[PDB]
Amino acid sequence: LIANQFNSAIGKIQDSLSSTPSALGKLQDVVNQNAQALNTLVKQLSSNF
Amino acid sequence: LVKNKCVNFNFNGLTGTGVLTESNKKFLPFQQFGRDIADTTDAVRDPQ
């Protein structure tokens, strides 16, 4: 029973982490904020000041 | 005109330093200067 429960839990994690909108927002926010900061630095290089 | 090499250009008053290559994109007939992004001259039309 313990082995079956562990195997089922691992399978459920694989199914839940394969719906294309799983809980990976904390990892995506870091890359998104770094890209936003870089793009904003470029866009403020565009200004004439 | 010497393409595929780094050169200072003064195209129609625009002074700058950089290498130019050959592109295959098509511009509109009414466009001469080109600032694709970030307030810099990506493209410019050679008057000749």
Side-chain angles (χ1 to χ4, degrees), chain A residues 42-43 46, chain B residues 37-38:
Chain A
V42 159
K43 294 295 94 176
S46 178
Chain B
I37 185 172

